[PDB]
Amino acid sequence: PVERILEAELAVEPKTETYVEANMGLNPSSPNDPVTNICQAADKQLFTLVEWAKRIPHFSELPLDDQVILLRAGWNELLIASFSHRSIAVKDGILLATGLHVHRNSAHSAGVGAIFDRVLTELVSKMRDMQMDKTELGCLRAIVLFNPDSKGLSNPAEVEALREKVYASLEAYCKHKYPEQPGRFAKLLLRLPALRSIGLKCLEHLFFFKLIGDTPIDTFLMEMLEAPH
Amino acid sequence: PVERILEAELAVEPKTETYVEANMGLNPSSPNDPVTNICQAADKQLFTLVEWAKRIPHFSELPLDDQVILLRAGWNELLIASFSHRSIAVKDGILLATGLHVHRNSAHSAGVGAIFDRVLTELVSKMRDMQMDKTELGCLRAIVLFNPDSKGLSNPAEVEALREKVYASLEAYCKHKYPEQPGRFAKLLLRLPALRSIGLKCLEHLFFFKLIGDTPIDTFLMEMLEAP
Amino acid sequence: PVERILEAELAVEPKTETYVEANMGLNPSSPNDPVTNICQAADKQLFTLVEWAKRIPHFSELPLDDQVILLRAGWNELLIASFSHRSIAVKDGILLATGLHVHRNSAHSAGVGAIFDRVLTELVSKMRDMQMDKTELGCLRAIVLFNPDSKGLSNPAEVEALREKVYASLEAYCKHKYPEQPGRFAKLLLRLPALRSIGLKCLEHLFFFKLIGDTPIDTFLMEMLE
Amino acid sequence: PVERILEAELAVEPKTETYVEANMGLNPSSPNDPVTNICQAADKQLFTLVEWAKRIPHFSELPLDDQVILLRAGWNELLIASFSHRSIAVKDGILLATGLHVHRNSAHSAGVGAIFDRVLTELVSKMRDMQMDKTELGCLRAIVLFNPDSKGLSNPAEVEALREKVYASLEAYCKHKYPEQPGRFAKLLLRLPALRSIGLKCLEHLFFFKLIGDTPIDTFLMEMLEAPH
């Protein structure tokens, strides 16, 4: 339950060295080729997401096609929830997995300032105000993952049952850990609608593409444009 | 107090005649004019909605500017939650205030079939299976109304405080009305994201406008350039 | 005849009373019911667009259903081309047909300032810098009305021909009235792409609805909540 | 030189070895990991797009930033215009590499049959019936590239002037090649609105991506899920 979901969060997402461009990236790879480079980044990021989902109790016991369904259904929300929580530490933009700080101005220059500000006000500041811990973020994500509304599921009910085991545990965790905050559980769950709407706006705006591709592309462009004809 | 909110939903709880007048045709307004009809409603729904919110404990105690900003940020989801709960008594269809019925066939023909089915499977069907009652519906809508993420409001904190009062009361209501089902509170709260996304999709794809159909457009459009 | 299109332009022109009847209430308005008032305004504006198209040469000679198609296909861009040209008189906002002047920051109302800014820079500001007259505007609108790409048309070629006649007149006019601007014609035509994209944005953000509705609605709401 | 435009257009058009080889499968890359194909094909496309733009008179004499801006603002319409013109060769379809490609069925099963209809109807067919040659096409793309409305440009009027030079030459070209068609010039310019809207629709619905299908997506995820837990 709770302890295995918090271990899932901690397992794939940290290492004081990774937040300094892992696999050497900071000192390796060195941005040069456009689309392939960014496609590799996305691949790396999604995979981390999968390794995490696989550590969620019972996720792997589900039919393979359902696991795929759930992943296509919640990947964007799962991602935004992770970097939003990670960002409570700063009051500017957002911190990425590599510990890199994406400042507010970068996103307004990229043309996604409005959606970026929603992330900041509706998720980051809200998470900061209630000091949402990793156990709690982990549970919300597991809840998002087990989305029984996903289309094509061979057995929505089983997914619904997995969802309830997680939230029944989130509530027990909260009441036991923060008894002085009787409405905390509801509060955590009530950040889900915001995540839902911001999630959709990020897709229509190609938010993730710009986040990992805009720089690599500008660099390649300015490089090729000034290069010898 | 929510039976003053449930009374707010009962002080407008679609009577009897209103349903037999449209679910038959024994209503005036002569169904000859289309524009006149669809607009009579909406204005009526907007009216009921405002009276509803005014009955919500503490709503009127917020600054005026904050009240309208809350009503216009939530009118869409508030309306959707209502006709979804009301359609529980129908299969693969939706019931509006006047007893007007719209079947999923119309939605698909009009191009908004996917969203219409999300309402049926993510909202209606779910409300049906857990037998969500009117009190709980009243609390979810009030929670929706007290949206602290709303842009431009002068005091998000005050709004989220009123929001907490409502969900805390709802939780109490669930624990005592349905003690045998410990996860009912969370379940109710977990329908909210569906409501959020369905709402955005309904706005994006002009849900309501499209349900009207195109023939009523071509009709008086042909009328303007085919006068006599 | 480029004048027959310029005449249809002035007749249906936003007149005077049409602006004083709405930007006032000189028409049993004073405003009471919100949504109904908004639909009436729409109906009103839509109708004038229909009176205009009928005065455009040959439009009424096209099969009824195709006419409807062309109308549904272009109403959005026709209204925008209209208020954008009319907005040339003002300095930082868009002047509507109902006489109502909607400013920038005031319009933005934390909702649709982005596409509102596009109308100013891409359309309004451009029409001013080149000072396109009503005749040129009228022709551009006829060209937009006669859109041969409209889905469903029974006879595209015929609409295409109607379109050609119009821009052939517009080109002639331009070379005659602005002899020093060889490229004025193409410059007029190169505004249509912007018109196209803005038209689509104005549909996903209910630009019109909000533009002629947030006031009646905020009024209503304020009385109700009192 | 309107030739420097057409020459720029001809020196970038796909050969006959990329149309034949891919047609039967005489090309490398070995279709086994169709994750590389789209990225590599993307890199290739972006590369040749820049080469082409640099060959457009006066483009490089523009500010670096403005050069980047215009390319980012138009790459989309620029690509659509090329394949649409390339599709004149295929019977009621779109061309990409492998022999005669996509037809309405694929587009239909992919859920983008309607925008496919627009592409054939508003671009391909129209280009065919009036026989738009490669010189007119090059000029159209250049006009598109020199988009004065692009956001961020340091000096819009400069770009507007470069656009005027291009269309003035296109008009001269039309007058000479088709004297009997006085309205040809206007006709060519009037295809731009279609390009504009079709371009937006292709972006918003990710036309090409969907055309490839969602089975490769399910497969690539499946691969992640089957990775050593």
Curated annotation (Swiss-Prot), chain B:
9-cis-retinoate binds at R86, A97. The modification Phosphoserine is found at S29, S30. Residues 1-228 form the NR LBD domain. Expressed in lung fibroblasts (at protein level). Expressed in monocytes. Highly expressed in liver, also found in kidney and brain. Acetylated by EP300; acetylation enhances DNA binding and transcriptional activity. Phosphorylated on serine and threonine residues mainly in the N-terminal modulating domain. This phosphorylation is required for repression of cAMP-mediated transcriptional activity of RARA. All-trans-retinoate binds at R86, A97. It comes from the Eukaryota. It is found in: Nucleus; Cytoplasm; Mitochondrion. Residues 118-138 are annotated as: Required for nuclear export. Induction: Down-regulated by aging. Induced by pulsatile shear stress. Composed of three domains: a modulating N-terminal domain (AF1 domain), a DNA-binding domain and a C-terminal ligand-binding domain (AF2 domain). Belongs to the nuclear hormone receptor family. NR2 subfamily. Receptor for retinoic acid that acts as a transcription factor. Forms homo- or heterodimers with retinoic acid receptors (RARs) and binds to target response elements in response to their ligands, all-trans or 9-cis retinoic acid, to regulate gene expression in various biological processes. The RAR/RXR heterodimers bind to the retinoic acid response elements (RARE) composed of tandem 5'-AGGTCA-3' sites known as DR1-DR5 to regulate transcription. The high affinity ligand for retinoid X receptors (RXRs) is 9-cis retinoic acid. Homodimer. Heterodimer (via C-terminus) with RARA; required for ligand-dependent retinoic acid receptor transcriptional activity; association with RARA is enhanced by pulsatile shear stress. Heterodimer with PPARA (via the leucine-like zipper in the LBD); the interaction is required for PPARA transcriptional activity. Heterodimerizes with PPARG. Heterodimerizes (via NR LBD) with RARB. Heterodimerizes with NR1H4; the heterodimerization enhances the binding affinity for LXXLL motifs from coactivators. Interacts with NCOA3 and NCOA6 coactivators. Interacts with coactivator FAM120B. This is Retinoic acid receptor RXR-alpha. The gene is RXRA. The chain holds residues 231 to 458 of 462 of the full protein.
